[PDB]
RNA sequence: AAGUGAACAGAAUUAAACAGUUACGAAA
């Protein structure tokens, strides 16, 4: 969960990351707004946001080169299909924070 | 003798305002000015401390004859409505607010909204260069109701000044609509509007005379 | 003593402008800087933060005696109108703006319109070569109005120069009509036009002097 | 909705798609301006835009061979008749993003 | 000291040119590049963005001595009129354009016309085969006026090149008349004519200096 | 445990510490809310707060310069891996209190 | 029929971060 996220994210390519934490505030705004809402009501009620959450990881993956190189390595699209329960969705929301905190640990 | 008058109203936000919550205490999204919400659910709630301090501020500048140097010490006609920490005659006030919650969730989900609070992007100019320090804030939705209940009670002895106190509460609520409420309202974010201003009796000991 | 003067006006847009909303935060269409709109409906509303940073900038370059270098520090005749983060005499501002909403929707559909926002094709040429980087923008509608309200109030003591403040607000609003408002209005996008500039008294404590 | 769209859009013919994002800037504007407007007022009031959306998939479909081959495979004209309610129209607007996000995933 | 000089002129189109505006956005058919018109009505309007990149390109060849490649990187006597994205001294521009609307429709429709934009039939020859590619374009009317106003303002402090700025704007508008404006101007379609070039004062702070 | 906290924390660099006790109320809120809750239930049950505690020492380490210079010297990330038992976690909760008492004695 | 990949910087800062009227009341 958090042990394998410190080594896979560091192993990249050329240094000096030109991507900051402000240009990726589109695909990260729905994951933070879903964990706090799924803990109140049930999971079978919110059906319009689950299908729309997967689109953000595909539409934004062909408009920037600093996005496709991170999804294929961290395997984001694979975890979007295994989830199906409300308790399982809570685990994927905590793993997304590892790709943001550890990303600015070596630079910004 | 001793009654419990309740002034039920619906606070309709004609313009999205901002309320500074508990910074550096929430989750990973503690930036972009975190707005205080519900500690259990996600429905944004408005605190009652910002209402008692703002209503008393606008009231202590038109119904007085001396500049207030320190709190809990200004005139006397309005000190018994909110309280007084330096007076020896009266201590407990006669106005009790309530942390109103967003009760507009019965029809807000039917329109299909993204989130309860959005993030607005702003910046500033140093008057010597272009864009500098790209900051960001957080606001709420527009046209949302709130269950606001005013717990009013008399101390039996203060019975000959009932009609005189009604014109003060009505003047304070109407004047509050023409001023920003919360925080960062200088740019035009506050300005509330009390909708459906009515009164009722819960304990049942005083007649019903006022309404609007 | 304490009055609430309201300067009701209609901001008529003689030319469609562009305002950069929350980048990377929209819904179904987030291409070429999505313009900020209403969090409930779809009518694009103009933010009140642009009316405070632009009007103060254009006024602090004609009514001053020293070149300003940082905000909240320019002359003194206009510091009490917007605010001051260094002076301990006054902190709150006497001018309150409001997010003006588009009230022209009651008759806009009768003229036969398509949508509220369109995509304008505008790119650039690198001189040495042909077409390079075919970018685009997103503008709003043309010939639209906005119900803007200016909440003005005095602090009792600020009474011996009420007429001096009226000529400053009137000159600031008229000067804004001959300048672009919003963002990237250098290509002829802004240029507002304040229509029906009148004044009224809501609280009722001061007489009516100005009107046009 | 989003699971069957990743396989049907990929199965085409010859590679190197000539249909870029320039010739699709006409039919993708009315769909984006429909989901955000149908949520405000009622569905029975907007009558000049519902019938006009079907015309774009008929007149503009015969101007290029690279248009009819995509409508018949994605079944766009079939869903235009089943919709009749405001809640049903919101579902068809989310399916349009699958033909744009997944299209640029393999090329552009 | 700080005035708002307005240059009111009438752009007369001697030949129906073509400007590639927001294409693929017409009524019942976007064929032959639909010319951008009014977003509310149907009167064709000219965009003000085309008058900024073409006038600056035709001017950055005579008032300078260094052939530049990227804009906002040339000299200094001409970069202030349009802006500079590198210099720290000045950032904003002093020239404000305006989307001029076709004001000639008040008397042209009385004569009896069909539409404002027609379709011209053309073709091309590859000089190796016969006639092929039956293409076509869309042009406008002939001899039409426009309301183009140039808003100019000084910064009071840097008031020295007053007479120098007059000879640049006058020469820039005269040189544009002898050159095509817009796209596809190689077959003799552009060539505008600024009729009635005058100046006036709207604010009221500096006397009328220039005129012709 | 508490003897080396008076020498390692004092040996720093330039005087006049600009960091007070109000800007560090985010990473110090979960340490006090963990020692008083791990004694009631078992340690194998609380699996969501343990992984989230390490995130606070990573996201807040790349934003302020007054945070990275303290974690590398006090070895905060090193003790997060040795712990694994409920009794061992009780010792780490007491070491954090030593870095705060001696910090306000020399300044604020 | 006709190469179309909005480009490049700052990623929230400088005040103020417990102020006061004050403590076993009447039995063995």
């Amino acid at each position: 969960k958090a042990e394998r996220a410190i080594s896979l994210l560091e192993k990249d390519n050329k240094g000096n990351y030109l991507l900051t934490t402000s240009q990726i505030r589109k695909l990260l705004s729905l994951c933070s707004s879903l964990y706090d809402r799924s803990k109140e009501r049930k999971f079978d009620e919110l059906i319009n946001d689950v299908s729309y959450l997967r689109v953000q990881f595909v539409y934004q993956a062909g408009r920037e080169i600093a996005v496709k190189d991170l999804i294929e390595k961290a395997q984001i699209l694979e975890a979007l299909k295994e989830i199906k329960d409300r308790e399982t969705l809570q685990r994927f929301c905590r793993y997304m924070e590892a790709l943001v905190a550890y990303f600015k640990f070596y630079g910004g | 003798t001793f009654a419990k008058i309740k002034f039920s109203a619906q606070i309709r936000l004609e313009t999205g305002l901002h309320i500074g919550g508990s910074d550096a205490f929430a989750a990973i999204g503690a930036i972009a000015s975190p707005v205080i919400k519900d500690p259990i659910t996600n429905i944004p709630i408005i605190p009652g401390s910002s209402l008692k301090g703002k209503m008393r501020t606008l009231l202590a500048k038109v119904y007085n004859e001396k500049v207030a140097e320190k709190p809990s010490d200004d005139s006397d006609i309005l000190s018994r409505l909110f309280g007084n920490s330096k007076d020896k005659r009266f201590k407990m006030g006669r106005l009790i607010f309530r942390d109103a919650f967003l009760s507009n969730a019965d029809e807000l989900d039917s329109l299909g909204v993204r989130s309860y609070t959005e993030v607005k992007f702003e910046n500033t100019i140093d008057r010597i260069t272009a864009e500098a320090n790209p900051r960001q804030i957080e606001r709420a939705i527009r046209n949302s109701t709130f269950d606001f209940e005013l717990i009013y009670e008399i101390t039996d002895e203060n019975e000959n000044q009932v009609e005189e106190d009604f014109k003060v509460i009505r003047d304070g609520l109407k004047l509050l609509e023409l001023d920003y409420l919360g925080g960062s309202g200088s740019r035009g974010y506050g300005k509330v509007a009390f909708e459906k201003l009515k009164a009722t009796t819960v304990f049942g000991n005083y007649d019903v005379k006022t309404l609007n």
Side-chain angles (χ1 to χ4, degrees), chain B residues 81-121:
Chain B
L81 277 76
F82 294 98
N84 206 165
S85 178
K86 299 291 180 68
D87 188 74
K88 299 284 103 176
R89 292 187 296 272
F90 59 93
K91 298 299 290 183
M92 294 177 71
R94 292 182 291 114
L95 293 175
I96 298 179
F97 286 165
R98 183 182 177 182
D99 290 332
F101 61 94
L102 193 145
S103 65
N104 209 166
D106 56 354
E107 66 183 1
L108 184 63
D109 189 74
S110 179
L111 276 75
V113 297
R114 183 176 178 179
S115 66
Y116 293 99
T117 57
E118 71 271 15
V119 176
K120 187 177 186 293
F121 289 165

CSV table of all heavy atoms in Angstrom, one decimal, chain B residues 81-121:
chain,number,residue,atom,x,y,z
B,81,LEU,N,-29.2,42.1,25.5
B,81,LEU,CA,-29.6,41.2,24.5
B,81,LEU,C,-28.6,40.2,24.1
B,81,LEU,O,-29.0,39.0,23.9
B,81,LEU,CB,-29.9,42.1,23.2
B,81,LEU,CG,-31.3,42.7,23.1
B,81,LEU,CD1,-31.4,43.9,24.0
B,81,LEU,CD2,-31.7,43.0,21.6
B,82,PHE,N,-27.3,40.5,24.2
B,82,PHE,CA,-26.2,39.6,23.9
B,82,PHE,C,-25.5,39.1,25.1
B,82,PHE,O,-24.9,38.0,25.1
B,82,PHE,CB,-25.2,40.2,22.9
B,82,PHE,CG,-25.8,40.5,21.6
B,82,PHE,CD1,-26.3,41.7,21.2
B,82,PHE,CD2,-25.9,39.4,20.6
B,82,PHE,CE1,-26.8,41.9,19.9
B,82,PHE,CE2,-26.4,39.7,19.4
B,82,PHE,CZ,-26.9,40.9,19.0
B,83,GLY,N,-25.4,40.0,26.2
B,83,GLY,CA,-24.7,39.6,27.4
B,83,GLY,C,-23.7,40.7,27.8
B,83,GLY,O,-23.5,41.6,27.1
B,84,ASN,N,-23.2,40.5,29.0
B,84,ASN,CA,-22.2,41.5,29.6
B,84,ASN,C,-21.4,40.7,30.6
B,84,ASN,O,-21.9,40.1,31.5
B,84,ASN,CB,-22.9,42.6,30.3
B,84,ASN,CG,-22.1,43.9,30.3
B,84,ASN,OD1,-22.6,45.0,30.5
B,84,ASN,ND2,-20.8,43.7,30.0
B,85,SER,N,-20.0,40.8,30.4
B,85,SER,CA,-19.1,40.1,31.3
B,85,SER,C,-18.6,41.0,32.4
B,85,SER,O,-17.9,40.5,33.3
B,85,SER,CB,-17.9,39.6,30.5
B,85,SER,OG,-16.9,39.0,31.3
B,86,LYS,N,-18.8,42.3,32.3
B,86,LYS,CA,-18.4,43.3,33.3
B,86,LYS,C,-19.5,43.9,34.2
B,86,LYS,O,-19.3,44.6,35.1
B,86,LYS,CB,-17.6,44.4,32.7
B,86,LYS,CG,-16.4,44.0,31.9
B,86,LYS,CD,-15.3,43.5,32.9
B,86,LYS,CE,-14.1,43.0,32.2
B,86,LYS,NZ,-13.3,44.2,31.5
B,87,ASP,N,-20.8,43.5,33.9
B,87,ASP,CA,-21.9,44.0,34.6
B,87,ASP,C,-22.2,43.0,35.8
B,87,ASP,O,-22.0,41.8,35.7
B,87,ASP,CB,-23.1,44.1,33.7
B,87,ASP,CG,-24.3,44.8,34.4
B,87,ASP,OD1,-24.2,46.1,34.6
B,87,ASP,OD2,-25.3,44.1,34.7
B,88,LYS,N,-22.8,43.6,36.9
B,88,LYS,CA,-23.2,42.8,38.0
B,88,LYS,C,-24.7,42.6,38.2
B,88,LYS,O,-25.1,41.8,39.0
B,88,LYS,CB,-22.6,43.5,39.3
B,88,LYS,CG,-21.1,43.7,39.3
B,88,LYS,CD,-20.4,42.4,39.7
B,88,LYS,CE,-19.8,41.7,38.5
B,88,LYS,NZ,-19.0,40.5,38.8
B,89,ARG,N,-25.5,43.3,37.4
B,89,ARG,CA,-26.9,43.2,37.5
B,89,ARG,C,-27.4,42.0,36.6
B,89,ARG,O,-28.1,41.1,37.2
B,89,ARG,CB,-27.6,44.5,37.0
B,89,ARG,CG,-27.4,45.6,38.0
B,89,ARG,CD,-28.2,46.8,37.6
B,89,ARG,NE,-27.9,47.4,36.3
B,89,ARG,CZ,-26.9,48.3,36.0
B,89,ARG,NH1,-26.3,48.8,37.1
B,89,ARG,NH2,-26.7,48.7,34.8
B,90,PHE,N,-27.1,42.0,35.4
B,90,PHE,CA,-27.5,40.9,34.5
B,90,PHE,C,-26.2,40.2,33.9
B,90,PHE,O,-25.2,40.9,33.6
B,90,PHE,CB,-28.4,41.4,33.4
B,90,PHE,CG,-27.8,42.5,32.5
B,90,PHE,CD1,-27.1,42.2,31.3
B,90,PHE,CD2,-27.9,43.8,32.9
B,90,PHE,CE1,-26.6,43.1,30.5
B,90,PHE,CE2,-27.3,44.8,32.1
B,90,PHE,CZ,-26.7,44.5,30.9
B,91,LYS,N,-26.4,38.9,33.6
B,91,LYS,CA,-25.2,38.2,33.0
B,91,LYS,C,-25.7,37.4,31.8
B,91,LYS,O,-25.2,37.6,30.7
B,91,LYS,CB,-24.7,37.2,34.1
B,91,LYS,CG,-24.1,37.9,35.3
B,91,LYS,CD,-23.0,38.8,34.9
B,91,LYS,CE,-21.7,38.0,34.5
B,91,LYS,NZ,-20.6,38.9,34.2
B,92,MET,N,-26.7,36.5,32.0
B,92,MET,CA,-27.2,35.7,30.8
B,92,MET,C,-28.0,36.6,29.9
B,92,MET,O,-28.8,37.4,30.4
B,92,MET,CB,-28.0,34.5,31.3
B,92,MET,CG,-27.1,33.5,32.1
B,92,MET,SD,-28.1,32.1,32.7
B,92,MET,CE,-28.6,31.3,31.2
B,93,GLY,N,-27.8,36.5,28.6
B,93,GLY,CA,-28.5,37.2,27.6
B,93,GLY,C,-29.9,36.6,27.4
B,93,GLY,O,-30.4,35.7,28.0
B,94,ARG,N,-30.6,37.2,26.3
B,94,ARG,CA,-31.9,36.8,25.9
B,94,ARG,C,-31.9,36.4,24.5
B,94,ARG,O,-33.0,36.2,23.9
B,94,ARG,CB,-32.9,37.8,26.2
B,94,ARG,CG,-33.2,38.1,27.7
B,94,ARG,CD,-34.3,39.1,27.9
B,94,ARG,NE,-33.8,40.4,27.5
B,94,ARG,CZ,-34.3,41.1,26.5
B,94,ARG,NH1,-35.3,40.6,25.8
B,94,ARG,NH2,-33.9,42.4,26.3
B,95,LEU,N,-30.8,36.2,23.8
B,95,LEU,CA,-30.7,35.8,22.4
B,95,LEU,C,-29.8,34.6,22.3
B,95,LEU,O,-28.6,34.7,22.6
B,95,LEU,CB,-30.2,37.0,21.5
B,95,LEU,CG,-31.2,38.2,21.4
B,95,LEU,CD1,-30.5,39.3,20.7
B,95,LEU,CD2,-32.5,37.8,20.8
B,96,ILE,N,-30.3,33.5,21.8
B,96,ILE,CA,-29.5,32.3,21.6
B,96,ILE,C,-29.7,31.8,20.1
B,96,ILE,O,-30.8,31.6,19.7
B,96,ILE,CB,-30.0,31.2,22.5
B,96,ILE,CG1,-29.8,31.6,24.0
B,96,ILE,CG2,-29.3,29.9,22.2
B,96,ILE,CD1,-30.2,30.5,25.0
B,97,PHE,N,-28.6,31.7,19.4
B,97,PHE,CA,-28.6,31.3,18.0
B,97,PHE,C,-28.5,29.8,17.9
B,97,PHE,O,-28.6,29.1,18.9
B,97,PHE,CB,-27.5,32.0,17.3
B,97,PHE,CG,-27.7,33.5,17.0
B,97,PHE,CD1,-26.7,34.3,16.6
B,97,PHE,CD2,-29.0,34.0,17.1
B,97,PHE,CE1,-27.0,35.7,16.3
B,97,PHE,CE2,-29.3,35.4,16.9
B,97,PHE,CZ,-28.2,36.2,16.5
B,98,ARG,N,-28.2,29.3,16.7
B,98,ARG,CA,-28.1,27.9,16.5
B,98,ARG,C,-27.3,27.7,15.2
B,98,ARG,O,-27.4,28.4,14.2
B,98,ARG,CB,-29.5,27.2,16.4
B,98,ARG,CG,-29.4,25.7,16.2
B,98,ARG,CD,-30.8,25.1,16.1
B,98,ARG,NE,-30.8,23.7,15.8
B,98,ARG,CZ,-31.8,22.9,15.6
B,98,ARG,NH1,-33.1,23.5,15.6
B,98,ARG,NH2,-31.7,21.6,15.4
B,99,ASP,N,-26.4,26.7,15.3
B,99,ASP,CA,-25.6,26.3,14.1
B,99,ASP,C,-26.5,25.7,13.0
B,99,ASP,O,-26.9,24.5,13.0
B,99,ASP,CB,-24.5,25.3,14.5
B,99,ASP,CG,-23.4,25.9,15.3
B,99,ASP,OD1,-23.2,27.1,15.2
B,99,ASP,OD2,-22.8,25.2,16.1
B,100,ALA,N,-27.0,26.6,12.1
B,100,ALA,CA,-27.9,26.1,11.1
B,100,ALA,C,-27.2,25.2,10.1
B,100,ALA,O,-26.0,25.3,9.8
B,100,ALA,CB,-28.4,27.3,10.3
B,101,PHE,N,-27.9,24.2,9.6
B,101,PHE,CA,-27.4,23.2,8.6
B,101,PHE,C,-28.1,23.4,7.3
B,101,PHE,O,-29.3,23.9,7.2
B,101,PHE,CB,-27.7,21.8,9.1
B,101,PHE,CG,-29.1,21.4,9.4
B,101,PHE,CD1,-29.8,20.8,8.4
B,101,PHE,CD2,-29.7,21.7,10.6
B,101,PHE,CE1,-31.2,20.5,8.6
B,101,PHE,CE2,-31.0,21.4,10.8
B,101,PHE,CZ,-31.8,20.8,9.8
B,102,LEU,N,-27.5,23.0,6.2
B,102,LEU,CA,-28.0,23.2,4.9
B,102,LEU,C,-29.1,22.1,4.7
B,102,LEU,O,-28.9,21.0,4.4
B,102,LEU,CB,-26.9,23.0,3.8
B,102,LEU,CG,-27.2,23.4,2.4
B,102,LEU,CD1,-25.9,23.9,1.7
B,102,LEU,CD2,-27.7,22.2,1.6
B,103,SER,N,-30.4,22.6,4.8
B,103,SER,CA,-31.5,21.8,4.6
B,103,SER,C,-32.1,21.8,3.2
B,103,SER,O,-33.2,21.3,3.0
B,103,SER,CB,-32.7,22.2,5.6
B,103,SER,OG,-33.1,23.5,5.3
B,104,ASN,N,-31.3,22.3,2.3
B,104,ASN,CA,-31.7,22.3,0.9
B,104,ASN,C,-31.3,21.0,0.1
B,104,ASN,O,-31.3,21.0,-1.1
B,104,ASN,CB,-31.1,23.5,0.2
B,104,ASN,CG,-31.9,24.0,-1.0
B,104,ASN,OD1,-31.7,25.2,-1.5
B,104,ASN,ND2,-32.9,23.2,-1.4
B,105,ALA,N,-30.9,20.0,0.8
B,105,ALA,CA,-30.5,18.7,0.2
B,105,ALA,C,-31.7,17.9,-0.4
B,105,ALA,O,-31.5,16.9,-1.0
B,105,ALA,CB,-29.7,17.9,1.2
B,106,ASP,N,-32.9,18.3,-0.1
B,106,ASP,CA,-34.1,17.6,-0.6
B,106,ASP,C,-34.3,17.8,-2.1
B,106,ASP,O,-34.9,16.9,-2.7
B,106,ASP,CB,-35.4,18.1,0.2
B,106,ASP,CG,-35.6,19.6,0.1
B,106,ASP,OD1,-34.7,20.3,-0.5
B,106,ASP,OD2,-36.6,20.1,0.5
B,107,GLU,N,-33.8,18.9,-2.7
B,107,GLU,CA,-33.9,19.1,-4.1
B,107,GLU,C,-32.6,19.5,-4.8
B,107,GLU,O,-32.6,19.7,-6.0
B,107,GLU,CB,-34.9,20.2,-4.4
B,107,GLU,CG,-34.5,21.6,-3.9
B,107,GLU,CD,-35.6,22.6,-4.1
B,107,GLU,OE1,-36.7,22.3,-4.6
B,107,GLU,OE2,-35.4,23.8,-3.7
B,108,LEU,N,-31.5,19.5,-4.0
B,108,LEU,CA,-30.2,19.9,-4.6
B,108,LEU,C,-29.7,18.7,-5.4
B,108,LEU,O,-29.0,18.9,-6.5
B,108,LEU,CB,-29.2,20.3,-3.5
B,108,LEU,CG,-27.8,20.8,-4.0
B,108,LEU,CD1,-28.0,22.0,-4.9
B,108,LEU,CD2,-26.9,21.0,-2.8
B,109,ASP,N,-29.9,17.5,-5.0
B,109,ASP,CA,-29.4,16.3,-5.7
B,109,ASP,C,-30.2,16.0,-7.0
B,109,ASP,O,-29.6,15.4,-7.9
B,109,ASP,CB,-29.4,15.1,-4.8
B,109,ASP,CG,-28.8,13.9,-5.4
B,109,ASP,OD1,-27.5,13.8,-5.4
B,109,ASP,OD2,-29.5,12.9,-5.8
B,110,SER,N,-31.4,16.5,-7.1
B,110,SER,CA,-32.2,16.3,-8.3
B,110,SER,C,-31.6,17.1,-9.5
B,110,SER,O,-31.7,16.7,-10.6
B,110,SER,CB,-33.6,16.7,-8.0
B,110,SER,OG,-34.4,16.6,-9.2
B,111,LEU,N,-30.9,18.2,-9.2
B,111,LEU,CA,-30.3,19.0,-10.3
B,111,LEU,C,-29.0,18.5,-10.7
B,111,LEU,O,-28.5,18.9,-11.8
B,111,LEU,CB,-30.2,20.5,-9.9
B,111,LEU,CG,-31.4,21.4,-10.0
B,111,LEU,CD1,-32.5,21.1,-9.0
B,111,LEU,CD2,-31.0,22.9,-10.0
B,112,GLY,N,-28.4,17.5,-10.0
B,112,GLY,CA,-27.1,17.0,-10.3
B,112,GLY,C,-26.0,18.0,-10.2
B,112,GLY,O,-25.6,18.7,-11.1
B,113,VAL,N,-25.4,18.0,-9.0
B,113,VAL,CA,-24.3,18.9,-8.7
B,113,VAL,C,-23.0,18.1,-8.5
B,113,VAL,O,-23.0,16.9,-8.3
B,113,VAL,CB,-24.5,19.7,-7.4
B,113,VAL,CG1,-25.7,20.6,-7.6
B,113,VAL,CG2,-24.7,18.8,-6.2
B,114,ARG,N,-21.9,18.7,-8.7
B,114,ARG,CA,-20.6,18.1,-8.6
B,114,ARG,C,-20.2,17.9,-7.2
B,114,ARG,O,-19.9,16.8,-6.7
B,114,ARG,CB,-19.5,18.8,-9.4
B,114,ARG,CG,-18.2,18.2,-9.4
B,114,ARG,CD,-17.2,19.0,-10.3
B,114,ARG,NE,-15.9,18.4,-10.3
B,114,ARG,CZ,-14.8,18.8,-11.0
B,114,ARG,NH1,-15.0,19.9,-11.7
B,114,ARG,NH2,-13.6,18.2,-10.9
B,115,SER,N,-20.1,19.0,-6.4
B,115,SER,CA,-19.7,18.9,-5.0
B,115,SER,C,-20.4,20.0,-4.3
B,115,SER,O,-21.1,20.9,-4.8
B,115,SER,CB,-18.2,19.1,-4.8
B,115,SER,OG,-17.7,20.4,-5.2
B,116,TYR,N,-20.3,20.0,-2.9
B,116,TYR,CA,-21.0,21.0,-2.1
B,116,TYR,C,-20.2,22.3,-2.1
B,116,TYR,O,-20.9,23.4,-2.0
B,116,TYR,CB,-21.1,20.4,-0.7
B,116,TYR,CG,-22.1,19.3,-0.5
B,116,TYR,CD1,-21.6,18.0,-0.5
B,116,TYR,CD2,-23.4,19.5,-0.5
B,116,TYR,CE1,-22.4,16.9,-0.3
B,116,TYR,CE2,-24.3,18.4,-0.4
B,116,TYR,CZ,-23.8,17.1,-0.3
B,116,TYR,OH,-24.6,16.0,-0.2
B,117,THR,N,-18.9,22.3,-2.2
B,117,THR,CA,-18.1,23.5,-2.2
B,117,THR,C,-17.1,23.4,-3.4
B,117,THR,O,-16.5,22.4,-3.6
B,117,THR,CB,-17.3,23.7,-0.9
B,117,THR,OG1,-16.5,22.5,-0.7
B,117,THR,CG2,-18.3,23.9,0.2
B,118,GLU,N,-17.0,24.5,-4.1
B,118,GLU,CA,-16.1,24.6,-5.2
B,118,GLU,C,-14.9,25.5,-4.8
B,118,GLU,O,-14.8,26.1,-3.8
B,118,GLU,CB,-16.8,25.3,-6.5
B,118,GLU,CG,-17.1,26.8,-6.3
B,118,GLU,CD,-18.4,27.0,-5.6
B,118,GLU,OE1,-19.0,26.1,-5.1
B,118,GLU,OE2,-18.9,28.2,-5.7
B,119,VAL,N,-13.9,25.5,-5.7
B,119,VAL,CA,-12.6,26.2,-5.5
B,119,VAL,C,-12.5,27.3,-6.5
B,119,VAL,O,-12.5,27.0,-7.8
B,119,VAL,CB,-11.4,25.2,-5.6
B,119,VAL,CG1,-10.1,26.0,-5.5
B,119,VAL,CG2,-11.5,24.1,-4.6
B,120,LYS,N,-12.4,28.5,-6.1
B,120,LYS,CA,-12.3,29.7,-6.9
B,120,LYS,C,-10.9,30.2,-7.0
B,120,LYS,O,-10.2,30.2,-5.9
B,120,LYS,CB,-13.2,30.8,-6.4
B,120,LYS,CG,-13.3,32.0,-7.4
B,120,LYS,CD,-14.2,33.1,-6.8
B,120,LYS,CE,-14.4,34.2,-7.8
B,120,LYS,NZ,-13.2,35.0,-8.0
B,121,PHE,N,-10.4,30.5,-8.1
B,121,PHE,CA,-9.0,30.9,-8.4
B,121,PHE,C,-8.9,32.4,-8.4
B,121,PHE,O,-9.7,33.1,-9.2
B,121,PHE,CB,-8.4,30.3,-9.6
B,121,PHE,CG,-8.2,28.8,-9.5
B,121,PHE,CD1,-8.0,28.1,-10.7
B,121,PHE,CD2,-8.2,28.2,-8.3
B,121,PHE,CE1,-7.8,26.7,-10.6
B,121,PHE,CE2,-7.9,26.8,-8.2
B,121,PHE,CZ,-7.7,26.1,-9.4
